[PDB]
């Protein structure tokens, strides 16, 4: 049906922290909750019955298939055919007892890189009739917790369970750099909008930035809880960080101030910016998918799921959101403007 906006309100949940600081609730500008490219609501349109907890989700480009990472395998679902209740293929990646933790498409959509609770990352050719393993990257760290691909498609970064960030030349499957610094597992990763900086979160309560050309750590932010997720605003300036403590913090990159956002009751497991950068989502162990205005975090929508929300992805045109669940499924939403 047609839906209409209906305004709600909460005790103040979004705070601006200054250099002092000095936390003041944010006075939302007129285009905080409504405007061009700002979602009106989101509607659930599919449920993908993976049958194991879904630690990683990715949507194809063009949007057509969804990849869900569970135990042992990635399942491929054709969401363009409405009636399908089962995957159209399955990518068997690691020990059946071990979880896939991250999967990423190359910018051009023809290859998927999969990492998880094993020392090998598999690289999958998606053109070949039935999908097949093209190559493997064999780390000496026991697990990968998060992957990122460079925008030029040449490199894959792997967040290792030892805290190291591995940088892999995809052409010849060689480790070309290793970023050392995190003293506990690196849990999350993104790349700056100009492609030159890497940003990582860790179970050592830090966010680190790394110069990709020079190879060195640039910045370190220390927090009072573990970092589980992060995302760099595609239009720059802002880094969103989701915490074990339930806070989302939006850091002003190379600046003194930040926002602290309080609409989760538990760990912020994952986060993703829309491609337009004007809003982002966070998912919680408290079962919530939250949509937020960039940078100051006005609440655009909330969707409560049946179980913890481990993972998420947003389609290239910002039309769909997919989340992965502790209830052993993924959920496809249409974003309604």
């Amino acid at each position: 049906d047609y839906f209409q906006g209906a305004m709600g309100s909460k005790p103040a949940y979004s705070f601006h922290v200054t250099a002092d600081g000095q936390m003041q609730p944010v006075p939302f500008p007129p285009d905080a909750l409504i405007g061009p490219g700002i979602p009106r609501h989101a509607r659930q349109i599919n449920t993908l019955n993976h049958g194991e907890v879904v630690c990683a989700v990715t949507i194809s480009n063009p949007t057509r298939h969804v990849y869900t990472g569970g135990k042992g395998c990635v399942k491929v679902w054709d969401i363009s055919h409405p009636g399908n209740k089962s995957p159209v293929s399955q990518l068997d990646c690691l020990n059946r007892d071990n979880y896939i933790r991250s999967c990423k498409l190359l910018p051009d959509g023809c290859t998927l890189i999969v990492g998880g609770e094993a020392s090998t990352l598999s690289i999958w050719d998606l053109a070949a009739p039935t999908p097949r393993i093209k190559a493997e990257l064999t780390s000496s760290a026991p697990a990968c917790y998060a992957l990122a691909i460079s925008p030029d498609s040449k490199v894959c970064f792997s967040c290792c369970s030892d805290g190291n960030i591995a940088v892999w030349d995809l052409h010849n499957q060689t480790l070309v750099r290793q970023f050392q610094g995190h003293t506990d597992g690196a849990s999350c990763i993104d790349i700056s909008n100009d492609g030159t900086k890497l940003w990582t979160g860790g179970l050592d309560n830090t966010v680190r930035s790394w110069d990709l050309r020079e190879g060195r750590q640039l910045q370190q932010h220390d927090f009072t809880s573990q970092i589980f997720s992060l995302g760099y605003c595609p239009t720059g300036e802002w880094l969103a960080v989701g915490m074990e403590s339930s806070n989302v913090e939006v850091l002003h990159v190379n600046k003194p101030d930040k926002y602290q956002l309080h609409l989760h009751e538990s760990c912020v497991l994952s986060l993703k910016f829309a491609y337009c950068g004007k809003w982002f989502v966070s998912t919680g162990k408290d079962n919530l998918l939250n949509a937020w205005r960039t940078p100051y975090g006005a609440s655009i929508f909330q969707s409560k799921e049946s179980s913890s929300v481990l993972s998420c992805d947003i389609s290239v045109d910002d039309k769909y959101i997919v989340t992965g669940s502790g209830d052993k499924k993924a959920t496809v939403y249409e974003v309604i403007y």
């Binding site: 907890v53 630690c55 071990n98 979880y99 609770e117 697990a143 917790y145 369970s161 597992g185 849990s187 179970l203 589980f228 074990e244 760990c267 497991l269 162990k285 913890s308 481990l310 502790g326």
Partner: peptide, 5 residues
């Protein structure tokens, strides 16, 4: 293995 969920 670290698993946050």
């Amino acid at each position: 293995m670290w698993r946050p969920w």
